[PDB]
Amino acid sequence: LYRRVINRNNRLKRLIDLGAPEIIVNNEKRMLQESVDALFDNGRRGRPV
Amino acid sequence: GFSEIMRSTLEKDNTVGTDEALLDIYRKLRPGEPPTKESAQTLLENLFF
Amino acid sequence: AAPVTHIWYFKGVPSRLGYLLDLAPKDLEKIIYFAAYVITSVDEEMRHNELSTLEAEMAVERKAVEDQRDGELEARAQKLEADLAELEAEGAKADARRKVRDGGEREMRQIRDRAQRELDRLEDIWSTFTKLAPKQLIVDENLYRELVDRYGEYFTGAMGAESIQKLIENFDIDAEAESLRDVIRNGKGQKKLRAL
Amino acid sequence: SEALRQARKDAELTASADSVRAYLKQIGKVALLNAEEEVELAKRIEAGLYATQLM
Amino acid sequence: RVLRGSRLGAVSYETDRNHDLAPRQIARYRTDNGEEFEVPFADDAEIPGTWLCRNGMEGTLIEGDLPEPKKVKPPRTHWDMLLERRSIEELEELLKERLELIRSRRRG
DNA sequence: AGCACAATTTAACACTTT
DNA sequence: AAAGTGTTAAATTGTGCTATAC
């Protein structure tokens, strides 16, 4: 779970510096939110990892 | 014809026709998907037939 | 690199972020998981005083829609005059002339109703702008771009945890505390039972 | 077809809480291109890059 | 069966002490957002100019040495990927072309 | 699976425009 | 008389718990 959080965080940090359309950045931020939610309390919102 | 409950529901149902019930079934089952003519007559035959 | 809401303070029972902002949990999940923009601020002074010039400019675009409508309607009138002139200049069958006059009415109806639909769209965007307030929702995802490219200087809107952070920034606790104290003191009903 | 041309309107306002399906419905709203539109878009991209470099 | 395991490391048995320890000196670095970090070092140690601090970002020493920018580049910054495959004469005879399309489309 | 419980909807209502 | 419009109850979902040692 820590690896998935820092993975999606590094990919967001790369997509922002590279310059990207809004859809890819919003999808990355939603994936980051779901990764941190899976870290803190799994299986609460949506299906569990 | 005996069916004292069936004609009661046939009064209180308000949905008349094949397509008018097909859109209701599709919108209650998906939910919220564009009604087509494939998903009308093939969804019911792709779930039980 | 982007803020993230703590899951205990959003997906509890009762949801504390929903109580602290007076937002429904079904709307909170639409905001923070990138499904609906939220208005987070609106300049009331500019929207108050420039309202007359904005609706005067809005009537220009509405009459432009109506003008293109009546231009296409005059085109349909001249086209149906040409049909009922050149087809009936000689001897002809009756029922095909009935169908020609029917199809002219059909295209005229199509013109005026397409214009009616886009007129209702232009009414809807202005009715949405005139009732703007913070902690709202725009689930359309096309109407917000129309509000950003046009009248985009009168407000701010965003998506997700940064917008929730912006709402928490502009949150005066004492005003909500005094209002919640006064509601349970004066009013009654379901409104009092909620405010506790 | 008011219903048929409604439920098509009322489809795009629902949650669909599975995020994969949300991303697929989000990317479904942009049309494809033909073999000669990408040429025009690439010409516009290269012209804009040359203009930003000269800037 | 029992299945012993170990996180790879060691446990030494020197009884601990607290009086004679080789002497140390303190450096102080300063990061970009005005933070100060104190780092101990041995006395026989070349104190470096830049240090990856506890904040997560690099901080230089408090002195004015200015060691190295080390001439590090961009990498590929698009353009470079445009200029390496297409030359300047082909772009200048294209951009102006596109520029004339701004002149003809504006008036029809 | 169920047993309890509290939060969140259809619908059922009088009240006020149209 | 229709048409909303807000306030007030039954349906409707989700959360939490369910013995002890080898």
Coordinates of C-alpha atoms (C1' of nucleotides) in Angstrom, one line a residue:
Chain A
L1 CA 0.0 0.0 0.0
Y2 CA 2.9 2.4 0.7
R3 CA 4.4 1.4 -2.6
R4 CA 1.2 2.1 -4.4
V5 CA 0.8 5.5 -2.7
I6 CA 4.4 6.6 -3.6
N7 CA 4.0 5.2 -7.1
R8 CA 0.9 7.1 -8.0
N9 CA 2.4 10.2 -6.3
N10 CA 5.5 10.0 -8.4
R11 CA 3.4 9.5 -11.5
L12 CA 1.3 12.6 -10.7
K13 CA 4.5 14.6 -10.0
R14 CA 5.7 13.6 -13.5
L15 CA 2.4 14.2 -15.3
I16 CA 2.2 17.7 -13.8
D17 CA 5.7 18.8 -14.9
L18 CA 5.3 17.2 -18.3
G19 CA 2.2 19.2 -19.1
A20 CA -1.0 17.2 -19.6
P21 CA -4.7 17.6 -20.4
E22 CA -7.1 17.8 -17.6
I23 CA -8.5 14.3 -17.9
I24 CA -5.3 12.4 -17.3
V25 CA -4.4 14.6 -14.3
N26 CA -7.9 14.2 -12.8
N27 CA -7.7 10.4 -13.3
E28 CA -4.3 10.4 -11.6
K29 CA -5.6 12.5 -8.6
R30 CA -8.6 10.1 -8.2
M31 CA -6.2 7.1 -8.2
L32 CA -4.0 8.9 -5.6
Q33 CA -7.1 9.5 -3.4
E34 CA -8.2 5.8 -3.7
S35 CA -4.6 4.6 -2.9
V36 CA -4.4 6.7 0.3
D37 CA -8.0 5.5 1.2
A38 CA -6.9 1.9 0.7
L39 CA -3.9 2.6 3.0
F40 CA -5.8 4.1 5.9
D41 CA -9.0 1.9 5.9
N42 CA -9.3 -0.8 3.2
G43 CA -12.7 -2.0 1.9
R44 CA -14.7 1.0 3.1
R45 CA -15.4 3.0 -0.1
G46 CA -15.7 0.7 -3.1
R47 CA -14.2 -2.8 -3.4
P48 CA -11.1 -3.7 -1.3
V49 CA -7.6 -4.0 -2.8
Chain B
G1 CA -57.9 -14.4 -15.3
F2 CA -58.7 -15.6 -11.7
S3 CA -55.8 -13.5 -10.5
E4 CA -57.4 -10.9 -8.3
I5 CA -53.9 -9.5 -7.6
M6 CA -52.7 -9.5 -11.2
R7 CA -55.4 -7.2 -12.6
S8 CA -54.8 -5.0 -9.6
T9 CA -51.2 -4.6 -10.5
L10 CA -52.2 -4.2 -14.1
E11 CA -54.2 -1.2 -13.0
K12 CA -51.6 0.2 -10.7
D13 CA -48.5 -0.5 -12.9
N14 CA -48.8 2.6 -15.4
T15 CA -46.2 1.1 -17.8
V16 CA -47.8 0.0 -21.2
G17 CA -45.9 -1.6 -24.1
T18 CA -42.8 -3.5 -24.9
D19 CA -40.3 -0.7 -25.4
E20 CA -41.7 1.4 -22.5
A21 CA -41.0 -1.5 -20.1
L22 CA -37.7 -2.3 -21.8
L23 CA -36.3 1.1 -21.0
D24 CA -37.5 0.8 -17.4
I25 CA -35.9 -2.6 -17.1
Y26 CA -32.6 -1.3 -18.6
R27 CA -32.6 1.8 -16.5
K28 CA -33.3 -0.1 -13.3
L29 CA -30.7 -2.8 -14.1
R30 CA -27.7 -1.0 -15.4
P31 CA -28.5 1.9 -14.0
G32 CA -28.4 5.0 -16.1
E33 CA -27.2 3.9 -19.6
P34 CA -28.4 5.1 -23.0
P35 CA -31.3 2.9 -24.2
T36 CA -30.6 1.2 -27.6
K37 CA -32.4 -1.4 -29.6
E38 CA -29.7 -4.0 -28.9
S39 CA -30.0 -3.6 -25.2
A40 CA -33.8 -3.8 -25.4
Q41 CA -34.3 -7.2 -27.0
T42 CA -30.9 -8.8 -26.3
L43 CA -30.4 -8.0 -22.6
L44 CA -33.3 -10.1 -21.5
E45 CA -32.2 -13.0 -23.7
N46 CA -28.6 -12.6 -22.5
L47 CA -29.5 -12.9 -18.8
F48 CA -31.8 -15.9 -18.8
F49 CA -31.9 -17.4 -22.3
Chain C
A1 CA 1.6 16.5 -4.8
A2 CA -2.2 17.0 -4.4
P3 CA -4.2 17.0 -1.2
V4 CA -6.2 14.0 0.0
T5 CA -9.0 13.8 2.5
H6 CA -8.7 11.5 5.5
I7 CA -11.1 8.6 5.0
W8 CA -12.2 8.5 8.6
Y9 CA -13.6 12.0 8.5
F10 CA -15.6 11.5 5.3
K11 CA -16.8 7.9 5.3
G12 CA -17.9 7.6 8.9
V13 CA -21.4 7.5 10.4
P14 CA -22.2 10.4 10.6
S15 CA -19.8 11.9 8.2
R16 CA -18.0 14.7 9.9
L17 CA -17.0 16.6 6.7
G18 CA -20.6 16.5 5.7
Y19 CA -21.8 18.0 9.0
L20 CA -19.0 20.6 9.0
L21 CA -19.9 21.9 5.5
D22 CA -23.6 21.1 5.4
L23 CA -23.1 18.9 2.3
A24 CA -24.8 15.6 1.7
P25 CA -22.5 12.6 1.7
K26 CA -23.8 11.7 -1.8
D27 CA -22.6 15.1 -2.9
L28 CA -19.4 14.9 -1.0
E29 CA -18.4 11.7 -2.8
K30 CA -19.2 13.4 -6.1
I31 CA -17.0 16.3 -5.2
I32 CA -13.9 14.7 -3.8
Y33 CA -13.7 11.8 -6.3
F34 CA -13.8 14.1 -9.3
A35 CA -17.4 13.9 -10.6
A36 CA -18.8 17.4 -10.1
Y37 CA -17.3 20.8 -9.9
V38 CA -18.1 22.9 -6.7
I39 CA -18.4 26.6 -6.6
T40 CA -16.1 27.7 -3.8
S41 CA -16.5 31.5 -3.9
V42 CA -18.5 34.2 -5.7
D43 CA -17.9 38.0 -5.8
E44 CA -21.3 39.3 -4.8
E45 CA -20.6 43.0 -5.5
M46 CA -19.6 42.5 -9.2
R47 CA -22.5 40.1 -9.8
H48 CA -24.8 42.6 -8.1
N49 CA -23.9 45.8 -9.9
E50 CA -23.0 44.4 -13.4
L51 CA -26.2 42.3 -13.5
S52 CA -28.1 44.8 -15.8
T53 CA -25.3 45.0 -18.4
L54 CA -24.9 41.2 -18.3
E55 CA -28.6 40.6 -18.9
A56 CA -28.6 43.3 -21.6
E57 CA -25.7 41.4 -23.3
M58 CA -27.6 38.2 -22.8
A59 CA -30.6 39.5 -24.6
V60 CA -28.3 40.3 -27.6
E61 CA -27.4 36.6 -27.9
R62 CA -31.0 35.5 -27.3
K63 CA -32.2 37.8 -30.1
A64 CA -29.3 36.5 -32.3
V65 CA -30.7 33.0 -31.8
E66 CA -34.2 34.3 -32.5
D67 CA -32.9 36.1 -35.6
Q68 CA -31.3 33.1 -37.1
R69 CA -34.5 31.2 -36.2
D70 CA -36.7 33.7 -38.1
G71 CA -34.2 33.7 -41.0
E72 CA -34.4 30.0 -41.4
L73 CA -38.2 30.3 -40.9
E74 CA -38.4 32.8 -43.8
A75 CA -36.2 30.5 -45.8
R76 CA -38.7 27.7 -45.1
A77 CA -41.6 30.0 -46.0
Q78 CA -40.0 30.9 -49.3
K79 CA -39.1 27.3 -50.0
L80 CA -42.6 26.1 -49.4
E81 CA -43.9 29.0 -51.5
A82 CA -41.5 27.7 -54.3
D83 CA -42.8 24.2 -53.8
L84 CA -46.5 25.1 -53.9
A85 CA -45.8 27.4 -56.9
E86 CA -43.6 25.3 -59.2
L87 CA -45.3 21.9 -58.4
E88 CA -48.8 23.5 -58.8
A89 CA -47.9 25.6 -61.8
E90 CA -49.1 22.6 -64.0
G91 CA -51.6 19.9 -63.3
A92 CA -50.8 17.6 -60.4
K93 CA -52.1 15.0 -58.1
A94 CA -53.8 16.0 -54.8
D95 CA -52.2 13.8 -52.2
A96 CA -48.6 14.5 -53.2
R97 CA -49.3 18.2 -52.8
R98 CA -50.7 17.5 -49.4
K99 CA -47.5 15.7 -48.6
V100 CA -45.4 18.6 -49.9
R101 CA -47.3 21.1 -47.7
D102 CA -46.9 18.7 -44.8
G103 CA -43.2 18.3 -45.3
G104 CA -42.8 22.1 -45.4
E105 CA -44.6 22.4 -42.1
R106 CA -42.3 19.6 -40.8
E107 CA -39.2 21.4 -41.6
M108 CA -40.6 24.7 -40.2
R109 CA -41.5 22.8 -37.0
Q110 CA -37.9 21.4 -36.9
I111 CA -36.4 24.9 -37.3
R112 CA -38.6 26.5 -34.6
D113 CA -38.1 23.6 -32.2
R114 CA -34.4 23.3 -32.6
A115 CA -34.3 27.1 -31.9
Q116 CA -36.6 26.4 -28.9
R117 CA -34.2 23.9 -27.5
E118 CA -31.2 26.1 -27.8
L119 CA -33.2 29.0 -26.4
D120 CA -34.0 26.9 -23.4
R121 CA -30.3 26.0 -23.1
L122 CA -29.3 29.7 -23.1
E123 CA -32.1 30.4 -20.5
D124 CA -30.8 27.6 -18.3
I125 CA -27.2 28.8 -18.2
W126 CA -28.3 32.3 -17.2
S127 CA -30.7 31.0 -14.6
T128 CA -27.8 28.9 -13.2
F129 CA -25.6 32.0 -13.1
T130 CA -28.1 34.2 -11.4
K131 CA -28.5 31.8 -8.4
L132 CA -24.7 31.3 -7.8
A133 CA -23.6 30.6 -4.2
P134 CA -20.7 28.7 -2.6
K135 CA -21.0 25.0 -1.7
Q136 CA -23.0 24.3 -4.8
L137 CA -22.7 21.6 -7.4
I138 CA -22.5 21.5 -11.2
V139 CA -23.0 17.9 -12.3
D140 CA -23.3 18.8 -16.0
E141 CA -19.6 19.1 -16.8
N142 CA -20.4 21.1 -19.9
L143 CA -22.3 23.9 -18.2
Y144 CA -19.2 24.7 -16.0
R145 CA -17.1 25.3 -19.1
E146 CA -19.8 27.6 -20.3
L147 CA -19.7 29.4 -17.0
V148 CA -15.8 29.6 -17.1
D149 CA -15.4 31.0 -20.6
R150 CA -18.4 33.3 -20.1
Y151 CA -18.9 35.2 -16.7
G152 CA -15.7 33.4 -15.6
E153 CA -14.4 36.3 -13.6
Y154 CA -17.2 36.4 -11.0
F155 CA -16.5 33.1 -9.2
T156 CA -14.1 30.3 -8.6
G157 CA -14.8 26.5 -8.8
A158 CA -12.8 23.4 -8.4
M159 CA -12.8 19.6 -7.8
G160 CA -11.6 17.4 -5.1
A161 CA -9.7 17.8 -1.9
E162 CA -8.1 21.1 -2.8
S163 CA -11.7 22.5 -3.2
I164 CA -12.6 21.0 0.2
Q165 CA -9.5 22.7 1.6
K166 CA -10.6 25.9 0.1
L167 CA -14.1 25.6 1.6
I168 CA -12.5 24.8 5.0
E169 CA -10.3 28.0 4.6
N170 CA -13.3 30.3 4.1
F171 CA -15.3 28.7 7.0
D172 CA -16.2 31.1 9.9
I173 CA -16.9 28.8 12.8
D174 CA -18.6 31.4 15.0
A175 CA -21.2 32.3 12.4
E176 CA -22.3 28.6 12.0
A177 CA -22.1 28.2 15.8
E178 CA -24.3 31.2 16.5
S179 CA -26.8 30.1 13.8
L180 CA -26.9 26.6 15.1
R181 CA -27.5 27.9 18.6
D182 CA -30.3 30.1 17.4
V183 CA -32.1 27.5 15.2
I184 CA -32.5 25.1 18.2
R185 CA -33.6 28.0 20.4
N186 CA -36.2 29.4 18.1
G187 CA -37.3 26.9 15.5
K188 CA -38.6 23.4 15.8
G189 CA -39.3 20.3 13.8
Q190 CA -36.9 18.3 11.7
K191 CA -34.7 21.4 11.3
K192 CA -34.1 21.6 15.1
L193 CA -33.4 17.8 15.3
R194 CA -30.8 18.1 12.6
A195 CA -29.0 21.2 13.9
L196 CA -28.1 19.4 17.2
Chain D
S1 CA -39.0 8.6 -28.4
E2 CA -39.3 11.1 -25.6
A3 CA -38.4 8.3 -23.2
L4 CA -35.8 6.9 -25.6
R5 CA -34.4 10.5 -25.9
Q6 CA -34.5 11.1 -22.3
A7 CA -33.0 8.1 -20.6
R8 CA -30.2 8.9 -23.0
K9 CA -30.1 12.3 -21.3
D10 CA -30.5 11.0 -17.8
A11 CA -27.8 8.4 -18.3
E12 CA -24.8 10.8 -18.0
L13 CA -25.8 12.2 -14.6
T14 CA -25.3 9.1 -12.4
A15 CA -22.4 8.2 -10.2
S16 CA -21.1 4.8 -11.4
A17 CA -18.9 4.3 -8.3
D18 CA -16.5 1.9 -10.0
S19 CA -13.6 4.2 -11.1
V20 CA -12.6 2.2 -14.1
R21 CA -16.1 2.5 -15.6
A22 CA -16.0 6.2 -14.7
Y23 CA -12.8 6.7 -16.7
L24 CA -14.2 4.8 -19.6
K25 CA -17.4 6.8 -19.7
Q26 CA -15.3 10.0 -19.4
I27 CA -13.1 9.1 -22.4
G28 CA -16.1 8.0 -24.4
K29 CA -17.2 11.6 -25.1
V30 CA -14.5 12.5 -27.6
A31 CA -14.7 11.3 -31.2
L32 CA -12.0 9.7 -33.3
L33 CA -10.1 11.1 -36.2
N34 CA -9.5 10.2 -39.9
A35 CA -6.2 9.8 -41.7
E36 CA -5.9 13.5 -42.7
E37 CA -7.0 15.3 -39.6
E38 CA -4.0 14.2 -37.6
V39 CA -1.8 15.8 -40.3
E40 CA -3.5 19.1 -39.7
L41 CA -3.2 18.7 -35.9
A42 CA 0.5 17.8 -36.2
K43 CA 1.1 20.9 -38.5
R44 CA -0.5 23.1 -35.9
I45 CA 1.6 21.5 -33.1
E46 CA 4.9 22.0 -35.0
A47 CA 3.9 25.6 -35.9
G48 CA 3.1 26.4 -32.3
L49 CA 6.4 24.9 -31.1
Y50 CA 8.3 26.9 -33.6
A51 CA 6.5 30.1 -32.6
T52 CA 7.1 29.5 -28.9
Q53 CA 10.8 28.9 -29.7
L54 CA 11.0 32.2 -31.7
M55 CA 9.2 33.9 -28.8
Chain E
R1 CA 8.5 -27.4 12.7
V2 CA 9.5 -23.9 13.6
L3 CA 10.7 -21.5 11.0
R4 CA 13.0 -19.0 12.4
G5 CA 13.7 -15.8 10.4
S6 CA 15.7 -12.6 10.7
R7 CA 15.6 -9.1 9.4
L8 CA 19.2 -8.9 8.2
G9 CA 21.4 -7.3 10.8
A10 CA 23.3 -7.9 14.0
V11 CA 23.1 -7.4 17.7
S12 CA 26.5 -6.6 19.4
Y13 CA 27.2 -7.0 23.1
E14 CA 29.4 -4.0 24.0
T15 CA 28.1 -2.7 27.2
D16 CA 27.1 0.8 26.5
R17 CA 29.1 3.9 27.5
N18 CA 28.7 7.5 27.8
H19 CA 31.9 9.3 28.6
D20 CA 34.7 8.8 26.1
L21 CA 33.5 9.1 22.5
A22 CA 35.5 10.5 19.6
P23 CA 34.7 14.3 19.4
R24 CA 32.3 15.8 16.9
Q25 CA 31.6 19.1 15.2
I26 CA 28.3 20.5 14.0
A27 CA 27.6 21.8 10.6
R28 CA 24.4 23.7 9.7
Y29 CA 22.7 23.6 6.4
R30 CA 20.1 25.7 5.0
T31 CA 17.4 24.5 2.6
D32 CA 15.4 26.5 0.1
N33 CA 12.4 27.3 2.3
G34 CA 14.4 29.0 5.1
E35 CA 15.0 26.0 7.4
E36 CA 18.0 25.2 9.4
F37 CA 19.4 21.7 10.1
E38 CA 22.2 20.7 12.4
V39 CA 24.3 17.7 11.4
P40 CA 27.0 16.2 13.6
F41 CA 30.2 15.0 12.0
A42 CA 33.5 13.5 13.0
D43 CA 36.4 16.0 13.3
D44 CA 38.5 14.1 10.7
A45 CA 35.8 14.5 8.0
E46 CA 35.5 16.8 5.0
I47 CA 32.2 18.6 5.6
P48 CA 30.3 18.7 2.3
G49 CA 28.6 21.7 0.8
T50 CA 25.2 20.3 0.0
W51 CA 23.3 17.9 2.2
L52 CA 20.0 16.1 1.7
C53 CA 18.2 17.4 4.8
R54 CA 15.4 16.0 6.9
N55 CA 12.9 18.2 5.1
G56 CA 13.3 16.1 1.9
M57 CA 15.0 18.8 -0.2
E58 CA 18.6 19.6 -0.6
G59 CA 20.2 22.3 1.5
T60 CA 23.6 24.0 1.0
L61 CA 26.0 25.0 3.7
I62 CA 25.7 28.3 5.5
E63 CA 29.0 29.6 4.1
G64 CA 29.5 31.2 0.7
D65 CA 31.6 28.6 -1.1
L66 CA 29.2 28.1 -4.0
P67 CA 30.8 24.7 -5.2
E68 CA 29.1 23.6 -8.4
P69 CA 26.0 24.0 -10.6
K70 CA 27.7 21.1 -12.5
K71 CA 26.3 22.2 -15.9
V72 CA 23.3 19.8 -15.7
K73 CA 20.9 20.2 -18.6
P74 CA 17.1 20.1 -19.4
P75 CA 16.9 16.9 -21.2
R76 CA 14.6 16.7 -24.3
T77 CA 12.3 19.5 -24.3
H78 CA 10.0 18.6 -27.1
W79 CA 11.6 21.2 -29.4
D80 CA 14.7 19.4 -29.3
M81 CA 12.7 16.4 -30.5
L82 CA 11.2 18.7 -33.2
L83 CA 14.5 20.3 -34.2
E84 CA 16.3 17.0 -34.4
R85 CA 13.8 15.6 -37.0
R86 CA 12.8 18.8 -38.8
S87 CA 15.0 21.7 -39.9
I88 CA 14.6 25.4 -39.6
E89 CA 13.9 26.1 -43.3
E90 CA 11.0 23.6 -43.4
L91 CA 9.5 25.2 -40.3
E92 CA 9.9 28.8 -41.4
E93 CA 8.3 28.0 -44.7
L94 CA 5.5 26.3 -42.8
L95 CA 4.8 28.6 -39.9
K96 CA 4.5 31.7 -42.2
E97 CA 2.2 29.4 -44.2
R98 CA 0.0 28.9 -41.1
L99 CA 0.4 32.6 -40.4
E100 CA -1.1 33.4 -43.8
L101 CA -4.0 31.1 -42.9
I102 CA -4.7 33.4 -40.0
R103 CA -4.9 36.3 -42.5
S104 CA -7.2 34.6 -45.0
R105 CA -9.6 32.8 -42.6
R106 CA -10.2 36.0 -40.6
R107 CA -11.8 37.9 -43.5
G108 CA -12.8 35.0 -45.7
Chain F
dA1 C1' -27.2 -14.6 9.0
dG2 C1' -29.5 -12.1 12.0
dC3 C1' -30.4 -8.9 15.4
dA4 C1' -30.4 -3.8 16.7
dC5 C1' -30.0 0.8 15.6
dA6 C1' -29.5 5.2 13.6
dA7 C1' -29.0 7.8 9.2
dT8 C1' -31.0 8.7 4.8
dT9 C1' -34.9 8.4 1.1
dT10 C1' -40.5 8.0 -1.4
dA11 C1' -44.7 9.5 -0.5
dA12 C1' -48.3 11.8 1.9
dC13 C1' -49.5 15.9 3.6
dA14 C1' -51.6 21.0 3.8
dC15 C1' -50.2 25.7 2.0
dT16 C1' -49.6 29.0 -1.4
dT17 C1' -49.4 30.4 -6.8
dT18 C1' -51.2 29.9 -11.8
Chain G
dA1 C1' -59.5 23.5 -10.6
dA2 C1' -53.6 22.4 -11.7
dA3 C1' -48.9 23.1 -10.0
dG4 C1' -45.5 23.3 -7.3
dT5 C1' -43.5 23.5 -2.3
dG6 C1' -42.0 22.6 1.9
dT7 C1' -42.8 19.9 6.1
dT8 C1' -43.8 15.4 8.0
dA9 C1' -43.7 9.6 8.4
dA10 C1' -42.7 4.5 6.6
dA11 C1' -39.2 2.5 3.6
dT12 C1' -34.1 1.9 2.9
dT13 C1' -29.3 1.4 3.5
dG14 C1' -25.0 0.7 6.4
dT15 C1' -22.6 -0.2 10.4
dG16 C1' -21.1 -3.5 14.3
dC17 C1' -21.2 -8.0 17.0
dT18 C1' -21.5 -12.7 17.5
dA19 C1' -17.0 -17.9 24.2
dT20 C1' -12.8 -20.0 25.7
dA21 C1' -8.4 -22.4 25.7
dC22 C1' -4.9 -26.7 22.6

